CSV table of N, CA and C in Angstrom, one decimal:
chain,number,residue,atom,x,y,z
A,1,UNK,N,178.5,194.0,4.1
A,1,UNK,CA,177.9,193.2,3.1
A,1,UNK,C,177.4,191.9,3.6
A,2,UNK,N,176.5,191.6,3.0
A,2,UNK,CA,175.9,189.7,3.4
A,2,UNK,C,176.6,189.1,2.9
A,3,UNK,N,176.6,187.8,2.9
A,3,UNK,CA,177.1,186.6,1.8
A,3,UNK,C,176.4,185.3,2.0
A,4,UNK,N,176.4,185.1,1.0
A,4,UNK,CA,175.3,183.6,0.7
A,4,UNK,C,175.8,182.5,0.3
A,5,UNK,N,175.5,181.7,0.4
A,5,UNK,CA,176.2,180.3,0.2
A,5,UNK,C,175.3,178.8,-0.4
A,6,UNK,N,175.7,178.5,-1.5
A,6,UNK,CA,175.0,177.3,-2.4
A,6,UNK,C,174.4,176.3,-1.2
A,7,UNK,N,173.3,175.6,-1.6
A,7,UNK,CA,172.4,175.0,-0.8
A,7,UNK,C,172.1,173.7,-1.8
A,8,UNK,N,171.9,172.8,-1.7
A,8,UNK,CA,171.3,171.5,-2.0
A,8,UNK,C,169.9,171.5,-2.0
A,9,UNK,N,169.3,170.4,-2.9
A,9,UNK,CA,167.9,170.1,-2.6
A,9,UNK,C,167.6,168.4,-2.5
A,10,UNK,N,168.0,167.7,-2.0
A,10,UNK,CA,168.1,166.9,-2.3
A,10,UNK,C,167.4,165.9,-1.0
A,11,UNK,N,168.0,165.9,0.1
A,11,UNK,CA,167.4,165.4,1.1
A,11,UNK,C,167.8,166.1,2.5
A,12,UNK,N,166.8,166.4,3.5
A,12,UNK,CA,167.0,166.6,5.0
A,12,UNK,C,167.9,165.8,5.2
A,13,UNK,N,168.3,166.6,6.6
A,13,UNK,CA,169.4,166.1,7.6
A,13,UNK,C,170.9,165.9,6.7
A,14,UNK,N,171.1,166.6,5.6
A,14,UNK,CA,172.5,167.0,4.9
A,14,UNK,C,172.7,168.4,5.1
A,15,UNK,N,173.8,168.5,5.8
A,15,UNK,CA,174.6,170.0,6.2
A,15,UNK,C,173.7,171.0,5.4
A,16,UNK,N,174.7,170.8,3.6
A,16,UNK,CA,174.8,171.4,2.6
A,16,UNK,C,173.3,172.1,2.2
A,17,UNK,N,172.1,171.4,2.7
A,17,UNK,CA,170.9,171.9,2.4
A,17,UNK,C,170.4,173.3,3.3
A,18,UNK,N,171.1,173.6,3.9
A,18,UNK,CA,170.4,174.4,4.9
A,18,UNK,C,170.9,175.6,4.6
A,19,UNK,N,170.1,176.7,4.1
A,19,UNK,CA,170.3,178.1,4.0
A,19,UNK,C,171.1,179.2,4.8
A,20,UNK,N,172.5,179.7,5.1
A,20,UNK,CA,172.6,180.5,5.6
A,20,UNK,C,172.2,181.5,6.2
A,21,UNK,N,172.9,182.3,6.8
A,21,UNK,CA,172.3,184.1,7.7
A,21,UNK,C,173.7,184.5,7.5
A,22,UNK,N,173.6,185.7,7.3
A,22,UNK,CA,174.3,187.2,7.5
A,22,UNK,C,173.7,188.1,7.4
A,23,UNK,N,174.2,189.3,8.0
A,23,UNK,CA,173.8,190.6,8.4
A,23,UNK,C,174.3,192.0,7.4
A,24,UNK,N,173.7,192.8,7.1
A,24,UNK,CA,174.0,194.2,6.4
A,24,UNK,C,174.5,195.3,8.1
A,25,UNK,N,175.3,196.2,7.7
A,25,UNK,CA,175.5,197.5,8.8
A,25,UNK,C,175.7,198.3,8.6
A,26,UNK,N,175.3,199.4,9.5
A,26,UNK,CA,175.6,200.8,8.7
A,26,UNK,C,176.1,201.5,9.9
A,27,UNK,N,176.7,202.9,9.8
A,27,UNK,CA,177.0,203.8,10.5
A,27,UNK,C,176.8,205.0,9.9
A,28,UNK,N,176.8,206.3,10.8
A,28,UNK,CA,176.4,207.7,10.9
A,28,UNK,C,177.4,208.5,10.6
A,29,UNK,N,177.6,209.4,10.0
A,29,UNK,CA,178.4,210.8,10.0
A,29,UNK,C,177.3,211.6,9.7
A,30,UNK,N,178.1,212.7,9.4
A,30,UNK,CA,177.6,214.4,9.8
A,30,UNK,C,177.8,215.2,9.1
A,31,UNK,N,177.0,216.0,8.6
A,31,UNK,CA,177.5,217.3,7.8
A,31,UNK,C,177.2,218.5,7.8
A,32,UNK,N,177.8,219.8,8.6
A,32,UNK,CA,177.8,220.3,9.4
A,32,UNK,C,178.3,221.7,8.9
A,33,UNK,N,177.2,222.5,9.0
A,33,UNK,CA,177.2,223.8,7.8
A,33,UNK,C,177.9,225.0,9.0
A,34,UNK,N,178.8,225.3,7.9
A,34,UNK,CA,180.0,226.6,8.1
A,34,UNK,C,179.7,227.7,7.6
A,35,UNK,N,179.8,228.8,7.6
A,35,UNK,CA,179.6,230.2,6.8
A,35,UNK,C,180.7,230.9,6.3
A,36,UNK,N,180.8,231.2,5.6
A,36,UNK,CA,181.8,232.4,4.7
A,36,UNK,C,180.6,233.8,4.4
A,37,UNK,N,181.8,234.8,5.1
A,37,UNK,CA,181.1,236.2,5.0
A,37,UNK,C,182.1,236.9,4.8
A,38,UNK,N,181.7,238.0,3.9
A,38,UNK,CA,182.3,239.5,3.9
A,38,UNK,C,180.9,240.8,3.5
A,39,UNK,N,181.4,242.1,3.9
A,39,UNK,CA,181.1,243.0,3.9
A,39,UNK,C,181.3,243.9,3.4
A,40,UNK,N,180.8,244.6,2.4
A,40,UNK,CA,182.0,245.5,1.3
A,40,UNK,C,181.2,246.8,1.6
A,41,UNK,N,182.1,248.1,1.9
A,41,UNK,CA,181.7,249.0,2.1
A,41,UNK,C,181.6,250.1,1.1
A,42,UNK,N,181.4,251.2,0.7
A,42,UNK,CA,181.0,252.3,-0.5
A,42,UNK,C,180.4,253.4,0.3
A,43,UNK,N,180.5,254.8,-0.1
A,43,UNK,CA,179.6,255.4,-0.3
A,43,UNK,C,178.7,255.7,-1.3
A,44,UNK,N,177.8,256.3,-0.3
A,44,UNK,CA,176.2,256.4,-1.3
A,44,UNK,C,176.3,257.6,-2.4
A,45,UNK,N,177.3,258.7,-2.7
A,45,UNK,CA,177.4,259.3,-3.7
A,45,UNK,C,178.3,258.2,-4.6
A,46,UNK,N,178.6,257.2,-4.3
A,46,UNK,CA,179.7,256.4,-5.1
A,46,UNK,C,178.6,255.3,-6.3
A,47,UNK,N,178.0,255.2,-5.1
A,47,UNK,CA,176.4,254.1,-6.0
A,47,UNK,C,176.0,255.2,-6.9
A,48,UNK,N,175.5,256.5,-6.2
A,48,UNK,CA,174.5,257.5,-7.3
A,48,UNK,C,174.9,258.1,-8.5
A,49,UNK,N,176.6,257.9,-7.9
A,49,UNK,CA,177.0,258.8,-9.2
A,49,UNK,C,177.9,257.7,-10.5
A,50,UNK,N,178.3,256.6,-10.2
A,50,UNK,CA,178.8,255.3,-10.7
A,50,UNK,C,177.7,255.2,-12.1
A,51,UNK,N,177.8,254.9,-13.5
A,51,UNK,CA,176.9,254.6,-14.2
A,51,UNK,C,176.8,253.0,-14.0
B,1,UNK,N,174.5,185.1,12.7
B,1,UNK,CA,174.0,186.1,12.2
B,1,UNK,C,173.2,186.8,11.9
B,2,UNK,N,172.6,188.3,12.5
B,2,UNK,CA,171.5,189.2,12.3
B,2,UNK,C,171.8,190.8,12.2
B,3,UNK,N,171.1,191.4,11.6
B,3,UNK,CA,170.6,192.5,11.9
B,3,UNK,C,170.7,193.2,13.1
B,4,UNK,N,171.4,193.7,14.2
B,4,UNK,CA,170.8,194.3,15.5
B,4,UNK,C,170.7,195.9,15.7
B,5,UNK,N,170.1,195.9,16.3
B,5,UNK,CA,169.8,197.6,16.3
B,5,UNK,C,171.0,198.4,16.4
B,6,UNK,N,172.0,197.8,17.0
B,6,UNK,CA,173.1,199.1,16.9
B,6,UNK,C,173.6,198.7,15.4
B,7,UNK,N,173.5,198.0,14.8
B,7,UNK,CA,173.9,197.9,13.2
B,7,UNK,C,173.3,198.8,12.4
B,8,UNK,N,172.0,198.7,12.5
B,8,UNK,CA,170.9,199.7,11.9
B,8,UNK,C,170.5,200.8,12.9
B,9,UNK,N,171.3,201.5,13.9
B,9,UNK,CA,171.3,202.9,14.2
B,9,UNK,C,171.0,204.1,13.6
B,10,UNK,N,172.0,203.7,12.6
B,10,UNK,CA,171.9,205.1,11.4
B,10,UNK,C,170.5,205.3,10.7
B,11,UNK,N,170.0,204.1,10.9
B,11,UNK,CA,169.0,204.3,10.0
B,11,UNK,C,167.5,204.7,10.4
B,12,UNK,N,167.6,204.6,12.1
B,12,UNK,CA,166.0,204.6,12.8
B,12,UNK,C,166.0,206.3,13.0
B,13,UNK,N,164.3,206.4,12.7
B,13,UNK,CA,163.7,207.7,12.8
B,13,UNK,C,164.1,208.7,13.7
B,14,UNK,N,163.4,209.5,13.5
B,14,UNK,CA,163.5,210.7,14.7
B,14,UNK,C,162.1,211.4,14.8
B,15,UNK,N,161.9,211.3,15.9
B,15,UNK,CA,160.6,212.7,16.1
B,15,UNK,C,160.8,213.5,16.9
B,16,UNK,N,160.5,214.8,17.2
B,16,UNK,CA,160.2,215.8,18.1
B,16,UNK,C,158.9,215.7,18.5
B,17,UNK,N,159.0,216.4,19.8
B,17,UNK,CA,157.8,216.8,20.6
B,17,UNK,C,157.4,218.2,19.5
B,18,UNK,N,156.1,218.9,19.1
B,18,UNK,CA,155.3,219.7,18.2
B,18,UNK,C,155.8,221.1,19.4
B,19,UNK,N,156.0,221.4,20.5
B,19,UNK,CA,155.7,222.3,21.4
B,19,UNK,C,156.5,222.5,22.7
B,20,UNK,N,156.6,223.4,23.3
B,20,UNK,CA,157.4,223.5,24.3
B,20,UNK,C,156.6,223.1,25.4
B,21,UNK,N,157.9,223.1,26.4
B,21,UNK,CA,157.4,222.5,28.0
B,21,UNK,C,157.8,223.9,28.8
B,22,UNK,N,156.8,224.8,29.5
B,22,UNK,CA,156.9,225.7,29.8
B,22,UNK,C,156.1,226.0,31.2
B,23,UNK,N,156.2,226.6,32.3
B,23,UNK,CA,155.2,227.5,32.7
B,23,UNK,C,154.2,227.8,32.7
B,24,UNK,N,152.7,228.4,33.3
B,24,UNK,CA,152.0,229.2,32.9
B,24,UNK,C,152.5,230.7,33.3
B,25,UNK,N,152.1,231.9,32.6
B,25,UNK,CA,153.0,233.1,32.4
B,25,UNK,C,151.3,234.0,33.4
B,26,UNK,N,152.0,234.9,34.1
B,26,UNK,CA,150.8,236.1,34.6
B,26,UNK,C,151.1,237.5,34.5
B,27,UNK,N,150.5,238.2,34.6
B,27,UNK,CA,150.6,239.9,34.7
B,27,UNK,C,150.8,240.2,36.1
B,28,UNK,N,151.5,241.6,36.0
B,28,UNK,CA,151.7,242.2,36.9
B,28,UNK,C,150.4,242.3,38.2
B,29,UNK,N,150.9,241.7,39.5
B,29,UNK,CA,149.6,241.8,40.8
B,29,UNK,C,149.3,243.6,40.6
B,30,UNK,N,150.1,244.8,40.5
B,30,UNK,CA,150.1,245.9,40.4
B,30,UNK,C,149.3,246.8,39.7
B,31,UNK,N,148.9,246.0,37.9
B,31,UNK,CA,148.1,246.1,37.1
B,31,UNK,C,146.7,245.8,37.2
B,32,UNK,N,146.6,244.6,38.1
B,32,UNK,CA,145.6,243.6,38.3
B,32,UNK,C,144.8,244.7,39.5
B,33,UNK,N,145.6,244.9,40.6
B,33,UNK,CA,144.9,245.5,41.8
B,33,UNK,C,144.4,246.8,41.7
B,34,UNK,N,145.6,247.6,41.2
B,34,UNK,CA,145.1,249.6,41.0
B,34,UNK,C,144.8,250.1,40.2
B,35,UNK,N,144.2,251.4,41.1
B,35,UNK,CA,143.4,251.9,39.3
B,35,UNK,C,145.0,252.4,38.9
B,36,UNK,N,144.3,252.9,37.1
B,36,UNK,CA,145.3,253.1,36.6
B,36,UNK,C,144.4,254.4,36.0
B,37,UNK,N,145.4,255.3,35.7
B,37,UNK,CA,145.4,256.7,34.4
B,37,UNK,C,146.1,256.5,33.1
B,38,UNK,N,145.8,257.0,32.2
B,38,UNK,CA,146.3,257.2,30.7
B,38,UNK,C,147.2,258.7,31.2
B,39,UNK,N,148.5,258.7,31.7
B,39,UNK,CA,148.5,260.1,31.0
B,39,UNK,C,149.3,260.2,30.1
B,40,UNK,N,149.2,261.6,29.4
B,40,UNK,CA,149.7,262.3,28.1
B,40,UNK,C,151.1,263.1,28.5
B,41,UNK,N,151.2,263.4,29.5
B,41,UNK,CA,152.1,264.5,29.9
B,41,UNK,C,153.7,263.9,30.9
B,42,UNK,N,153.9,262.9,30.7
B,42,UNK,CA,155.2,262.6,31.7
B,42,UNK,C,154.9,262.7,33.1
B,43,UNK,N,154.8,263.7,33.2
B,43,UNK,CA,153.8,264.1,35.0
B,43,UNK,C,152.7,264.0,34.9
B,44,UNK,N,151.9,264.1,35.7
B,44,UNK,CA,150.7,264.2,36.5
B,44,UNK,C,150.9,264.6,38.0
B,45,UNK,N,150.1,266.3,37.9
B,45,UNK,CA,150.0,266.8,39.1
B,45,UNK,C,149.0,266.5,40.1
B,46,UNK,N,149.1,266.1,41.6
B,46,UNK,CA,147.8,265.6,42.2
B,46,UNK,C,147.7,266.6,43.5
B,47,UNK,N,146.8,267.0,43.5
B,47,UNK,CA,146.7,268.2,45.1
B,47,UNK,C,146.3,267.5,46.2
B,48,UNK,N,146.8,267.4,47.3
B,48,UNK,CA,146.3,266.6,48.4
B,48,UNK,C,145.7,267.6,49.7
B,49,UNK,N,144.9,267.3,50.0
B,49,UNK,CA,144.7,268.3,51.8
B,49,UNK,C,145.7,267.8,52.6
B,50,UNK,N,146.3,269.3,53.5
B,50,UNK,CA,147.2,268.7,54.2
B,50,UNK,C,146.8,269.2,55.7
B,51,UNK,N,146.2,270.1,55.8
B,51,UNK,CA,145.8,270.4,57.1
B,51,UNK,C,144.2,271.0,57.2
């Protein structure tokens, strides 16, 4: 995260007038595709004759 | 404090090359040099003079 800090307007060459810096960061992860399978067997008079 | 590239890593593009890096590919010298036949039958018989 940044952070920012109150600033003055009043006159140069006072600390308090001068606008800060900070930085934002990020990092990477992954998401990483797996499979689930099965196979179901029958016979074909089982399909034909099944209503 | 800044921003630096390994901060914002996660975040820069990606491109691919459109095509592969390959070879050029040729035909058989075999094809290129002899005659050739169509045949229909597995064999082809050829009679030669022998004496």
């Amino acid at each position: 995260l940044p952070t920012a800090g109150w600033v003055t307007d009043d006159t140069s060459g006072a600390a308090t007038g001068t606008k800060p810096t900070s930085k934002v960061s990020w990092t990477g992860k992954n998401l990483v595709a797996e499979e689930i399978a099965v196979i179901v067997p029958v016979h074909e008079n089982t399909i034909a004759d099944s209503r | 404090a800044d921003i630096s590239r390994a901060d914002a890593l996660a975040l820069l593009a990606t491109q691919e090359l459109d095509s592969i890096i390959k070879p050029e590919t040729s035909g058989s010298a075999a094809l290129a040099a002899f005659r050739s036949i169509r045949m229909s039958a597995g064999t082809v018989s050829m009679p030669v003079l022998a004496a």
